[PDB]
Amino acid sequence: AFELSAAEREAIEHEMHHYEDPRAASIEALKIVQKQRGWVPDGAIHAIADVLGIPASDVEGVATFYSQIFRQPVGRHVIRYCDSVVCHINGYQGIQAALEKKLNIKPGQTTFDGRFTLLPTCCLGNCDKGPNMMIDEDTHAHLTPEAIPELLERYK
Amino acid sequence: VACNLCAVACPVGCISLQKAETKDGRWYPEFFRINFSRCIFCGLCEEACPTTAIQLTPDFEMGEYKRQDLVYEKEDLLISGPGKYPEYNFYRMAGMAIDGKDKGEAENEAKPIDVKSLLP
Amino acid sequence: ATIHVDGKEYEVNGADNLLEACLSLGLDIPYFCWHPALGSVGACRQCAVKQYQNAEDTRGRLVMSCMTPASDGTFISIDDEEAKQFRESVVEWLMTNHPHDCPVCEEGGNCHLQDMTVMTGHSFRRYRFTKRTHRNQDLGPFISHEMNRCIACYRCVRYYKDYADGTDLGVYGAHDNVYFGRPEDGTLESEFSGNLVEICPTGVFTDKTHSERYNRKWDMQFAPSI
Amino acid sequence: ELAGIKDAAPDATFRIRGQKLAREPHRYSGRTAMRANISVHEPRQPQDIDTMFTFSMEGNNQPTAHRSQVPFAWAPGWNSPQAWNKFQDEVGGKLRFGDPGVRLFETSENGLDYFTSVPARFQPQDGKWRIAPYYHLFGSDELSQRAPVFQSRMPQPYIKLNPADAAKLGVNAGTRVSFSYDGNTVTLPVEIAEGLTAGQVGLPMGMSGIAPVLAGAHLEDLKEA
Amino acid sequence: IIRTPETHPLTWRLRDDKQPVWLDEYRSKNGYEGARKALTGLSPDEIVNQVKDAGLKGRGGAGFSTGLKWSLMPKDESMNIRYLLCNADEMEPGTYKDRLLMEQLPHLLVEGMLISAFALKAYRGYIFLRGEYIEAAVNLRRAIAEATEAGLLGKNIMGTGFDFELFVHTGAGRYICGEETALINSLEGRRANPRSKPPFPATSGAWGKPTCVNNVETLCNVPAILANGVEWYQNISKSKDAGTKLMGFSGRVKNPGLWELPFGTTAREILEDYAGGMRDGLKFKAWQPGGAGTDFLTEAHLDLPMEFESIGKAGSRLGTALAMAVDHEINMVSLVRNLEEFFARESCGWCTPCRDGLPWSVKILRALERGEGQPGDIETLEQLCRFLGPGKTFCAHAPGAVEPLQSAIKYFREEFEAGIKQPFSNTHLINGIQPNLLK
Ligand SMILES: NC(=O)C1=CN([C@@H]2O[C@H](COP(=O)(O)OP(=O)(O)OC[C@H]3O[C@@H](n4cnc5c(N)ncnc54)[C@H](O)[C@@H]3O)[C@@H](O)[C@H]2O)C=CC1
Ligand SMILES: Cc1cc2nc3c(=O)[nH]c(=O)nc-3n(C[C@H](O)[C@H](O)[C@H](O)COP(=O)(O)O)c2cc1C
Ligand code: SF4
């Protein structure tokens, strides 16, 4: 049983005002639900579709198209390490190995206490300061495998 | 798997069968009859079989008194072993899921990835 | 409009695309994503022909015949070597993930993908890696679902959503993991969902009522009826 | 007035270069085995004296054959429903020798007069319920509702009620009500219909026990039972 | 390196502490002056003509003429609803220019969108920004609020009667969303598949209306053109490509970064004078000129001017002009495997060659990296490069995908042959059936 909160519904309608078609608010409606609840659960697809007046199949096609809209439950903090070409040259593999050793999980997995979800991501547009990674809204550059356990500890 | 390729490949048209399905979803012949009074033992059915189910065997002594008895049903054809091809299993290659072989368990198959997966 | 195909002059409708013009003339161009009732979208890239601007042009360029107007003065080649190789390559790319399913597939002997695999002349497999797989959905009593056989031609969603105005079928996922079906298990709610079994060029959407007592198309006795 | 049905199809003497039209594909299989359990002697193929089609593959199904009645589409290299391309004048157009069927009547030169019999507006009256027809694609046709695959697709039987009429009857959604029509007191669970105008009950026409002749009829003694 | 307004129109107002420049500081150093001149003294047609005669090309990577793209909007006054979209997606690996432009100079982008929207008669503007640029989103929203407060956005801008609303649309993370028609589809709330052209977005784009999609850096180039004139912009450099481009070098160099340079400066000038050369103990092996979708070039091509035409004749693309250096310690097979893994997983899935042929190349490169390559693998890669070129696929994602693969096979074939160790085997033995042994 999914119900959109008042804050979620008002945010979705306010974003509906920004376009000439309410369908154009589907991505940000999914992002609003994800920001409130960590991810987009299954009933949120039908709730968002009902608010925007578009089919649930379109909402789910959007949600499963875009990589940053999570349709599976994640941890409290999403680590997104860049695995693209410049960070590969700058040695993201050591960063990924350090993250895997500290968290004892694989990419795409969530730690057993629900704290961290480790994810590869495409280039973060910070290639001159690589290797880069992204915790929830914070980007960390100039990464070394030694600074990974200290820098992960400030996200509780 | 009652795919009916042997029946259409038969130039005599002396094979008649019907597809049926089990609960887990595997295909099998509900019946399988061969008119051996018509059959010319050309082997085109065995050549056309994609599962090596139907096989021509080294046995020539099939003389009969009444030629209605030359109509062999599935009870007179299905033997208790692999015959000439000892190891081939069509279902180990097919993508269709049956009992004991889920999606992704066939040969050269990756595990299915849900579209809701977090990996890009 | 006058077009030239492999050095032969033809009179066509200039308001038509090249694929429908050439198929109306009896020429064989393989195709998946185009349908006469649905229009052209240029997805599958199967319908490639070589195009020349002049008669005295030998380089040419591969184009989609479904996305190219059959205007006056166009020169195309279907039997060009590069066009044939590319169409065979498109079939081969579709074959890399396709399941080994034809004996236990209800589309066999009635399958457009089988026909176009044979038509391009692709019969040797050199891909040696894994094939992607998908779980299936329950779509109700009429349509059986087998997403392993999908070639991602988008015909089902174009018919169901754009043509029939249905709402419960769609495309999900991304790059090579595109999935065609409902957002969850349930009966397809369109009154015209059954046309998917002929619209889909593979055995993804099949007639479940026929699948209960299945026979191949060559074994069928047909008649024209109302 | 039915004189046009002569031209709907050619008669049984029609041939394509002397041969009849095939009912089955040329690779039709099992001819000497499909009846062999009944008898090892193959009978004659059944004869069709009624039409131009033959009950065998020994006939014509060429896409260029001059006919309009095409039993199935097949061309060499085109085994799918895309084989219908070869049977058309242009793809997505007409069958290349005309579509089968003929219109019985043309448009008349003169029209009718205006119908002056404008009805009065609908009035709900107490104890009397107007039957609003609700048709179903799965269920309202007699023969297709007899088909076993339609039973799962068919809706559960119901009676539609306005919220005001259901509140007046003291009836909620899902409760069974009984009504009598022509000595048949039948019971049906109630579904609430927002859009149905008050003074009407909605009935599924053509189902078991609900004849389509009940459309526009009246109802008495609709009570919760 | 000094930054005068004449030689560095984009980066001269950048602060030393890397802090964003807000409205009062931006207007102090000649901010919204080009917007004032364009909106109070010029009709939209002569602004479009001024941008066309300035020779401003697309900074997104393709180098199409901006004035020519603006002039392709329909001339009829019936279509009064028009859209200007700023492509702030920037998802190409190796590209970080738009992040620098939007993070610390948001008012430059806002002024550029205002001038361009007046020229295009676009009543609405959207900044299609990637979701990972949080600081850019915060600074752009703050600058839009500041410009709305000081009458520079909204209703009756500068008393001219021109209405313009600027919105920021944050993305949800797909690289294909930067493609302009897929950008338009994503802005409409759909799956970001690209669209066939023609029709181009200029005639029927966002919601069927006339639409112009322009890069961040292109719109940041327009206000200096409107403020300092066309003749100043033509005489920035003596090259066919006018103006200044944000160029840079990244990857194991001494000073990886981003500098505003005139078109025609050589890649060796960027690598040694600006990037400081390669790091200590590392030898230069190769370089990519314009992002992950460009062909590799060797040390011999380092003395090439960074122009569209000169890099084009060397069998590559100028691209985003943000070059990446590859040192001798980098295996080229592993690098191309990483690139192709990115490109295959960023396929939108619309068309067969990209969606189903990029993963084949990924699996071949994975086998080559492990030493499990088989004969025919390199020929398969070369055929994949040939058959994923321009026109074979629905959009340009796959030609860009196969540019580094074909260039690495061309220049470093010995590393690809080193992975072929096993004989080719596609079949297992089936007992009872003799194989057809080819010769
Ligand atoms: N993050 C980034 O900045 C990325 C940049 N790119 C760049 O993208 C480029 C390819 O992009 P495309 O849009 O496919 O290039 P394109 O050459 O097809 O077109 C570029 C622009 O010119 C316009 N245009 C071109 N011909 C036109 C015509 N005849 N009429 C009207 N408008 C016309 C298009 O609408 C578009 O805005 C590459 O050069 C690559 O470097 C690629 C990937 C990522
Ligand atoms: C796969 C692909 C991704 C692209 N991504 C971007 C992008 O992120 N940002 C961008 O400005 N252009 C991108 N482009 C180029 C655009 O299609 C278009 O040329 C540009 O956004 C606007 O043109 P302009 O350079 O004249 O401003 C991409 C092109 C392709 C084919
Ligand atoms: S061997 Fe007999 S049953 Fe088999 S194809 Fe030949 S005639 Fe038919």
Ligand code: SF4
């Ligand atoms: S015996 Fe072989 S060819 Fe015949 S129906 Fe069975 S599986 Fe098919």
Ligand code: SF4
């Ligand atoms: S969809 Fe066609 S090619 Fe695929 S298994 Fe079925 S019959 Fe064979």
Ligand code: SF4
């Ligand atoms: S399910 Fe069928 S119609 Fe739909 S995209 Fe796949 S192959 Fe095409």
Ligand code: SF4
């Ligand atoms: S090349 Fe084809 S599948 Fe790939 S991103 Fe472009 S349209 Fe999508």
Ligand code: FES
């Ligand atoms: S390559 Fe990692 S931030 Fe760009």
Ligand code: FES
């Ligand atoms: S039929 Fe033309 S690309 Fe699909």
